[PDB]
Amino acid sequence: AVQQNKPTRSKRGMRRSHDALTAVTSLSVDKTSGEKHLRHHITADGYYRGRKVIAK
Amino acid sequence: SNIIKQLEQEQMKQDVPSFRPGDTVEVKVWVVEGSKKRLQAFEGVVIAIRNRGLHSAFTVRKISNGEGVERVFQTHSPVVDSISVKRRGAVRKAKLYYLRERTGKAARIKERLN
């Protein structure tokens, strides 16, 4: 099964109208290290909710 | 749930004797033939027991008048008037379905001396 007519650039765009990515609404700030992180994830420096969970 | 366990507890028989698969039991059941209600005995080996509270059941197998018959009794049903163990059998499985393929000497169950 294959198209009988070439779909337009218009139809292509209409289809892609749902493809836009969603940005993270807000980053969280660690209460101790003050660095930004994904909510409920640890920070880049190994902090979670003020606690130095992971070292090195 | 506590509600349903209460509803079932109020209905359970308090006089059920202990028995095990392989035991020979006699079950007395009410039979109504007209306005006449009488007790009929069904005696055989217990081949299965379902322990499920009010919904507990057990299956009794017998050879009767040349034919093998199984009856799955609902333990707490008022149709069952009394249960009595006639013989303690010694088996190792919970379910004795293999006896369906045995007759006579090959169907014998060793007595449980205890």
Partner: protein, 209 residues
């Protein structure tokens, strides 16, 4: 006649003296609190809206809380409406309990049926399977034809095909009332009713009678 909102506790059995086992659904019907009375002048129809159960306070929004407070009634877990018959009158804040069914022989029970997700035509519509063997190529549970030819040149509306099954309102009609237990807030009806254990049920006197 109005009905009551309950909860599907589960099923069990009642053994009678003559050796019948009655399969029963146990329905917990706590007191139904009238939260609003609707009348012809203000609403165009006669009905009561009720609530039952309870909801955690921080889960009740200010609009819903104001609605409950106007009735002077503690917040329940939802709101359901029952249409009023001619001789039927109720007051806001009035409590209605399961003794409402004391003399009712049969009830209609409405619940949300269990959800089967995306169902095939075999399960959803009792379509027969094609051959398991005898050369069948990849077409064992598939629907078969879905129409005709050039006439009509389309599939008809309402064609039975695969899709969502269950997770919908269902009513089972004229179930025997086995027992009304006012002290324990319980209604036992003979037989199965829609929905999973713990889900809401709407119980009304049988419409067919």
């Amino acid at each position: 006649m109005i009905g009551l909102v309950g909860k599907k506790v589960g099923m069990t059995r009642i053994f009678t003296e003559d050796g019948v086992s009655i399969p029963v659904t146990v329905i917990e019907v706590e007191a139904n609190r009238v939260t609003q009375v609707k009348d012809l002048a203000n609403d165009g129809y006669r009905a009561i809206q009720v609530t039952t159960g309870a909801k955690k306070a921080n889960r009740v929004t200010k609009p819903e809380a104001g609605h409950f407070a106007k009735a002077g009634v503690e917040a329940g877990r939802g709101l359901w409406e029952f249409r009023l018959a001619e001789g039927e009158e109720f007051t806001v804040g009035q409590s209605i309990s399961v003794e409402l069914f004391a003399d009712v022989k049969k009830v209609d029970v409405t619940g949300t049926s269990k959800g089967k997700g995306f169902a095939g035509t075999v399960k959803r519509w009792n379509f027969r399977t094609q051959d398991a063997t005898h050369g069948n190529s990849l077409s064992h549970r598939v629907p078969g034809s879905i129409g005709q030819n050039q006439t009509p040149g389309k599939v008809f509306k309402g064609k039975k095909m695969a899709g969502q099954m269950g997770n919908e309102r269902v009513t089972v009609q004229s179930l025997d009332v086995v027992r009304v237990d006012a002290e324990r807030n319980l209604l036992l009806v003979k037989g199965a009713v829609p929905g999973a254990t713990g889900s809401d049920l709407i119980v009304k006197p049988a419409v067919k009678a």
